[PDB]
Design a binder for these strands. Structure first.
Lengths: 379, 379
RNA sequence: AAUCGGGAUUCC
RNA sequence: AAUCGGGAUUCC
């Protein structure tokens, strides 16, 4: 059998793996793919290549690309690779490429998707360091939050009807059980929340303010203003209408992002900054100042909701001849990709939000901390 | 089938797991054991217990204890659990216990074992921040290192005979390949090393200075002097004679430690401090001052060499009646445990040292850093 | 991606 | 045990 270069389109669930890039001994998506290539009979041995995107730990992807030389001679090869692969990783197709094709260089654009529970937009709890800081803004009258005021007031109403004035604001048998029941009560109060139209409008205003070509040095752990890479371009960004899904009936929103290229954890930093602005009520224009002088520390959002929709290859497509090599279009798989998304990615995100408590953790930590200086009605 | 409380003795390889304690969704030794209990038919469902030691991520254990109620009615049950378990986790035996038995409380003592490559004792490289600091000690004449002087001089001799004055002390095709070949040369020079008797004597002197009852606040990430837990007692500690094992013919030493109880990463902090004292040549008595006033930051050693030999249960053994319940003695399995050690733990440590480059990483990082103030011939 | 020094949260 | 703010190393 001869060697033949080829490109493999793949989809996977990022949960339970240490990223896309091969990095032993920790199990990675590439490691599992390689293990499935020798079980189907397309790889030789020893060692060896490129990839469209290097998705971080836990990040899923409806679409990703690898490029390698394999024995593409068996008519039923992709079926064998899929039978030798776990249910959470699928190979959509195997299309041939040329020697000039570079997976990292010829990546024109990228489509990402972030699932976000709507209760992430509720303001901080009374008694938190961020609330008292926003309260300390009672000098310069900023924004006022009447929505989260009624939410936390209703939670305090429910707590006094379920507890009997237990000073359970202290921890380190039944007191453990009391505090756990209290935390479960807060989590259920968050999961019962239904977002308004004004909060969604503010969130979409910030997301729209992300659009265009800007310096994104404050949305990455990297060099500052006078760096080349910091300038990047967002082509499209859309926050979907909220929807309720799951047994717990949590409410979610889907943020679809279209970009040229991306920095380290740029998407998560952007989504976190948007949620932080929407939460306290800081002026939406304060996001533009994040492009400005003073460097700020914004923590990136949980990687659980991050999902790489698809990489685009406009440059390689146009430069392709009329006959001989097919174009790289991910829209030609939308049926199987949508089914796999719904089954293995989306449902896993819902279950892991309900159990692993990722998004509750993230914002219970934001209130106890650097980034407060930006959203403190003064910077 | 009725419920029956029991204690399971277990052994495992820590590589590829996130610790002993059950912590989903990350795969743990307890998670794999539970998955193997329902595949053999000893657990019901839903959820649920104690454990002798909570071994950190990557740490292996020739012996560990769990306690749970299971259906111990099938005569060939342990064989089924072992057939339903990966090769890297074994159940040695399943002996019954009483309701009073507490795995964490009645743990009398613990035997740990650390495998350490001898090249960890070689002093810092010329041009490192720690060398120049030890060089800055050319005022107060401390210790002088003639052993590592000839080692690094011989490496510089070999580099000039293999390279042609390439200023490859700069990085960020072939220059990458040049630097990689240079680093492989340094690693091979370390692996060819054979420890002397004086260095081993100094290492054993420090290890012996660990013995007795002392305040170990500087050997844990925790509270300082005026804390209760900091006082702990070491009963026995022995560094074995060096031995050469493996295809790469690396030289190792085995440090066996016997203690009452242990703090967070106490063993690794102790081993790292011993190696740090032996390396630069700081006075062995400086380890005693680590029990003293000034708090110091000592980084814990790689968890790869750490191996929990066995927990002891002297209190539960003596308080046991003459008939009815068997004593918890781990020495009754030494054959199978030694075979499993040699095959799955020790060989894995050797392979992971050669490949994953753990111990080379650790000490190449010590030279570039807080802890230098202790071993700088002045504190 | 992994390790380590500290600071913080969630599950333990 | 996991996440995050920075500082450092190893493999990339």
């Amino acid at each position: 059998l001869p060697k033949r270069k080829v490109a493999v389109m793949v989809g996977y669930c990022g949960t339970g793996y240490h990223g896309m890039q091969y990095n032993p001994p920790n199990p990675t998506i590439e490691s599992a793919l390689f293990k499935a290539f020798v079980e189907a009979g397309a790889i030789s041995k020893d060692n060896s290549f490129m990839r469209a995107a290097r998705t971080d730990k836990g990040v899923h992807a409806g679409g990703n690309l690898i490029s390698l030389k394999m024995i593409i001679e068996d008519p039923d090869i992709k079926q064998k690779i899929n039978e030798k692969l776990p249910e959470g990783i699928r190979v959509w197709d195997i299309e041939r490429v040329n020697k000039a094709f570079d997976c990292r260089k010829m990546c024109s654009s990228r489509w990402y998707e972030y699932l976000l529970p709507t209760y992430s937009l509720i303001g901080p709890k009374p008694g938190s360091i961020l609330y008292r800081d926003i309260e300390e803004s009672k000098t310069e009258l900023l924004d006022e939050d009447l929505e989260s005021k009624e939410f936390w007031e209703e939670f305090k109403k429910d707590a006094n009807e379920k507890f009997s004035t237990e000073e359970i604001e202290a921890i380190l048998e039944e007191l453990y059980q009391k505090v756990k029941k209290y935390k479960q009560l807060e989590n259920a109060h968050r999961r019962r929340y239904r977002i308004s139209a004004a909060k969604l409008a503010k969130f979409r205003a910030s997301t729209s303010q992300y659009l265009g070509a800007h310096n994104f040095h404050n949305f990455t752990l990297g060099k500052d203003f006078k760096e080349p890479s910091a300038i990047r371009f967002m082509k499209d960004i859309k926050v979907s209408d909220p929807f309720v899904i799951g047994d717990a009936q949590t409410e979610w929103i889907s943020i679809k992002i279209h970009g040229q290229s991306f920095m380290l954890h740029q998407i998560r930093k952007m989504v976190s900054m948007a949620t932080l602005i929407t939460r306290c009520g800081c002026p939406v224009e304060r996001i533009s100042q994040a492009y400005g002088q003073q460097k700020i520390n914004i923590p990136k959002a949980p990687a659980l909701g991050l999902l790489l929709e698809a990489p685009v290859f406009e440059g390689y497509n146009k430069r392709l001849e009329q006959f001989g090599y097919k174009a790289i279009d991910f829209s030609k798989y939308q049926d199987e990709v949508d089914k796999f998304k719904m089954k293995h990615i989306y449902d896993k995100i819902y279950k892991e939000e309900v159990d692993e408590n990722v998004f509750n953790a993230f914002f219970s930590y934001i209130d106890s901390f650097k980034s407060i200086f930006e959203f403190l009605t003064a910077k």
